[PDB]
Structures are given as structure tokens and as C-alpha cells.
Amino acid sequence: LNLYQKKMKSIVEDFLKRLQIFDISRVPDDQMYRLRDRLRLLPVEIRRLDIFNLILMNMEQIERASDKIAQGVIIAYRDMQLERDEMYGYVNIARNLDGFQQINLEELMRTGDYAQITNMLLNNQPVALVGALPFITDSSVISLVAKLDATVFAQIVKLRKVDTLKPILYKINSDSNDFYLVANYDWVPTSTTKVYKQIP
């Protein structure tokens, strides 16, 4: 689970405590770590193991199954045709990456930026971002026209961060959108961008 962080002490501490017998603390450091060194080389009670194998197989499915948060977004600076799905109505979703580089946000954020992204964005090039992410729904037909989705991005560079990267979706249903002076005029949705949250 690539949790390249706790692993050392963390688990060990709780372990010993539950054993009662001894009061950690006074456990020389070569001891606690060495204790892991030995632990990591054993099987796993079928029970225990058998379950993890299960969680991992469905892991993916859960993550995209949620209501808040989708996996990454795409930028193409190419007027794009908004798609339509029975559940969200008229929205800009993409069920598949393929045709645009992938940039492990996790990788970037954790390791600092070299602006590779900064250059691609600047000379305005097709690019994708992967991982879990915030989220924003909007009903402002107008919005789309204002090209809001191509905004949010600039940000990142100033703050050297990327947490504040709420992207945008346009839940434009033929209803709850006071903004409907749309189907009254011959026309088609020009979304400059869309997202990965696969359909429930």
C-alpha cells in the first residue's frame, strides 16, 4: 500500500503495549527496529492475509464509486464536445485517459516541481493529472461560456502545493438550471475540459 511512512516504530509500539509484560520506552532503538526486521519475514495467518487480498481487488472500484472526489483531470485547450449521461444529464466526464501524458500528482507534490508541468501549461499543451482530487459541481450554463474550467489551474505555480486544486464539473440538467436559455437556441456545449470520475 505504498505507505512509505510509518512502518517502523508505529506498529511496534502498539504491539508491545498489548503484550502488557513490558513498558516499551526503555527498549533500546536497535531493539525495536530489529524487531521489525524479523517480523517482516514471515507468512501471514491465512485469515489475516486472505482478507487484504480481497480489499485490494475492490480498492479501485470504491475510490471511483464515491460521490466526492474523482481521479484527475484533462486539459486540451481544444473546444470539446460535452458528453451526455442519463444520470448527470449534460456533463463533461471522461471514462478514459489515453492520448495524454500522465503526471502522478502524488509524485510531483511529494518531490517538488521542476515545472515540467509549468512549461507544458505555459506553451499550453495537452496534459493529464492523476490521483484522487477535490471536486466542484456547477449549474451556471453561463459558466461554461466563461470558460471557468480553464482557470483554476494557473494557481498551482504560485503556491507550490496543489491541494487547492478544485476542478470543475457542469451538472447541467435540463431543469435545476435556471440557466436554460440554451436548448432554446441551436447550439452545442463547448467544454474545454472534463474529468475521470467513472459513473456509479
Binding site: 491465512i46 486472505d50 487480498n53 480481497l54 481487488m57 478514459n96
Partner: protein
């Protein structure tokens, strides 16, 4: 490539270990591997065929997985699984066949088909697993540039060759001296004949020799060597060297004298056997040299004396011979042998689908032609093609 392999051992160890009843904890380690696959696949499109009489079937992926749960397996579990396997089987078959026909002068050792080229892709490597099938085993060890090796019962190292050489002849062909032989597969039979029964020969002995150069080195060979060449022990009417007439061969057989078999490697004698008939070992050689003599019998009963006069006509032709058979051996290069179906599988798939002759292999995958001019390109293509045939035979026979 290696990718491909897995796909099968996956299915085999699958269509095998997944039966109504078995306990789950026997497949826990397996089940997993399986699913892992489905995932990597789903979302991919393929295409096979397009050549000669080979259909162009298209494939897509979109499958659910498998409950891991259940102490034991219920019939229902299987059937919902078998249904998914059958699509992969019918798939691989088409995948194998599609890459089992194309040949490339250049990189006849690399993947060809649109189907496979896509597999060597990195995103698919997450599927490799259990490479113990003798062929793949050797495919790897080679890709890493190391010492390969295979096993063959009655290997097929000798291109068919049946001929003679007249060392002494004349128009009437009434007093010939020479040798005739048959080299084919793993066997050699050679006879030395002297119509005069060495009457005017020094020490009344006529020397003979037969040399056979293998196209590939054989190691660890178990060989049967026997005196006499039964194939050349009967009366024959043969065409003359120039094809203009026919001569008569009327053999009478004597024991080969001073038999010496040498198994040489790059001109060096590695093994030598003097008059030893039965089972002998030749541990590493690229050439076999058989030397034997016809010695006129110094003492003859009347019946024998009558066959060998001091003057022509010579009506009974003194003949000595040898028979050598390579029962088993190891070769660093793939070869056809008397047990493996690889050559037959490749040849059969190509014939069934009317695959056009290509730039590498001889028409009909003819073995004699192939082994006679066993170029590096033919060997690399043959190995690729034999390895695929072996992957296919794990599921489809």
C-alpha cells in the same frame, strides 16, 4: 512474449485446479494471479488474422471478477468461470496462430503480429508467472545471453542424403570400388564395396571412409553403432553417376575390419572408438567420421574361394558396412526429433490456413531444406515459432 506464456499456464493450472468441489485454500494463491489479469486486459482491443485463409476475428474485454469467498466450490461457481475461460482459450489460439506464420528476415527473433507486439508493452508485464515449461525456460536463459539446451530422442540432425561415390569405375561398371550411404534423421548407414575383393590391393585391404558434418553441435549423445549396413546388403540396379546408364550391385557381406569412429569438434577428435559395437557416448561433436576396411579373407573354404576369382568377371561384390544411430542428444539449437510435435504443429497450422511461402522458411517448412541451410535467421524464427507451438500445446492439442 514471456507475457504470452503466462496467459496459458494461467488457463491450464486453471481449467485444471478449478473443479466442482475442491477446497478454496488450494487456489487462493491462484485465484489472485487470475483476476490480476482480467484487470490489466479490460479496456483493450485486439485484432488477429488478415493473412491467407486466416479469419480476422476481433476481441474486446470487459469482465467481472471472482468471489474469493466460499470454503468449497459449488458447481455454479465453475460454470460462471468456465464461460470466461472459453473466451480466452478461443482467443490465445487465434493469437498463437497469427504470430506462428509471419517471418522476418531482419529480426526473425522479435514479435511480429499486431496482436503480440502490443503485449510486449510494459503495462502488460504485470501478468508474468510460473515459467517452468521447458521451452520458455530456455527462451529466457537465451534472451539474457546464456547457455541454452534441449532434449531429443532420435534427433533430426541429418538432412536426407542417399548417394554413392565410385572411387574406381569404368564404363561397363563391372569392377567398381566406392561407398554408398543414407544419412537421414538420426541415422547413418554406409557401405564400402570392392568388386575385386582387394585382389590387387596392398595387404589385400581396401580402406573406406564416410564423413558426416552436422549443421549444429550435438552434446551428450547416446549412440548405437552396429557392424553391417542392411540397407546396402541386397542386389541393386543403380543409375550411373552421369545418369546415362545403370549398373549392377550384387553384394556379399564381410565383417568391417579396423572400424574406427571419430566424433570431432572443430577438427579435433573428442571421442574415438575402435571396433566397439553396441552403445557408445559422444559427448560433444559437430562431425562424425567412420573409417572401416574390407580385408580379403586370407583363408577361404571352396564355397567362399569360388566367389572371389583372380580374374574378372567379378560376380559377387565384397561389401563391408556400418550403421550408426543417435538415440538421444542435447543441442543448443532447436531441432525436430522423433518425439516432439513442434515442427508438425507449426507446419500443420501453416498448411491448414494456406499460409503463403515467406522469406525465411523453405516451402512447406521442409525439414531437409531447413537443416541443410540452417541460417541464423531460420534458427531464430524456428525457435520463436517452436516456443509458441509449445505454449499452444499446453491448452490445445
Amino acid at each position: 512474449m514471456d507475457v504470452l506464456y503466462s496467459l496459458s499456464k494461467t488457463l491450464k493450472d486453471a481449467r485444471d485446479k478449478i473443479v466442482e468441489g475442491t477446497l478454496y485454500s488450494n487456489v487462493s494463491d491462484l485465484i489472485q494471479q487470475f483476476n490480476q489479469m482480467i484487470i490489466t486486459m479490460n479496456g483493450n482491443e485486439f485484432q488477429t488474422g488478415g493473412i491467407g485463409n486466416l479469419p480476422i476475428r476481433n476481441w474486446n474485454f470487459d469482465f467481472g471478477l471472482l468471489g474469493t469467498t466460499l470454503l468449497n466450490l459449488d458447481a455454479n461457481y465453475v460454470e460462471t468461470a468456465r464461460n470466461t475461460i472459453d473466451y480466452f482459450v478461443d482467443f490465445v489460439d487465434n493469437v498463437c496462430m497469427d504470430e506462428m506464420v509471419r517471418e522476418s528476415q531482419r529480426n526473425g527473433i522479435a514479435p511480429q503480429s499486431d496482436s503480440l507486439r502490443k503485449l510486449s508493452g510494459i503495462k502488460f508485464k504485470r501478468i508474468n508467472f510460473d515459467n517452468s515449461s521447458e521451452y520458455i525456460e530456455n527462451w529466457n536463459l537465451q534472451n539474457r545471453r546464456q547457455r541454452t539446451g534441449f532434449t531429443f530422442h532420435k534427433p533430426n540432425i541429418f538432412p536426407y542424403s542417399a548417394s554413392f561415390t565410385l572411387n574406381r569405375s569404368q564404363p561397363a561398371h563391372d569392377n567398381l570400388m566406392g561407398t554408398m550411404w543414407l544419412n537421414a534423421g538420426s541415422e547413418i548407414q554406409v557401405a564400402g564395396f570392392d568388386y575385386s575383393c582387394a585382389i590387387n590391393a596392398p595387404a589385400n585391404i581396401q580402406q573406406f571412409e564416410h564423413i558426416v558434418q552436422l549443421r549444429r553441435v550435438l552434446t551428450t549423445a547416446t549412440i548405437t553403432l552396429l557392424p553391417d549396413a542392411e540397407r546396402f546388403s541386397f542386389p541393386r540396379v543403380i543409375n550411373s553417376a552421369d545418369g546415362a546408364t545403370t549398373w549392377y550391385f550384387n553384394p556379399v557381406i564381410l565383417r568391417p575390419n579396423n572400424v574406427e569412429v571419430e566424433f570431432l569438434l572443430n577438427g579435433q577428435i573428442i571421442n574415438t572408438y575402435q571396433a566397439r559395437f553396441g552403445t557408445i557416448i559422444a559427448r560433444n561433436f559437430d562431425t562424425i567420421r567412420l573409417s572401416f576396411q574390407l580385408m580379403r579373407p586370407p583363408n577361404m573354404t571352396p564355397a567362399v574361394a569360388a566367389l572371389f576369382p583372380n580374374a574378372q568377371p567379378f560376380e559377387h561384390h565384397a561389401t563391408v558396412g556400418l550403421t550408426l544411430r543417435i538415440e538421444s542428444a542435447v543441442c543448443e539449437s532447436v531441432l525436430a526429433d522423433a518425439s516432439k510435435t513442434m515442427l508438425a504443429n507449426v507446419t500443420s497450422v501453416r498448411q491448414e490456413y494456406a499460409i503463403p511461402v515467406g522469406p525465411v522458411f523453405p516451402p512447406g517448412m521442409n525439414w531437409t531444406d531447413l537443416i541443410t541451410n540452417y541460417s541464423p535467421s531460420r534458427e531464430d524464427n524456428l525457435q520463436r515459432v517452436f516456443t509458441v507451438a509449445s505454449i499452444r500445446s499446453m491448452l490445445v492439442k
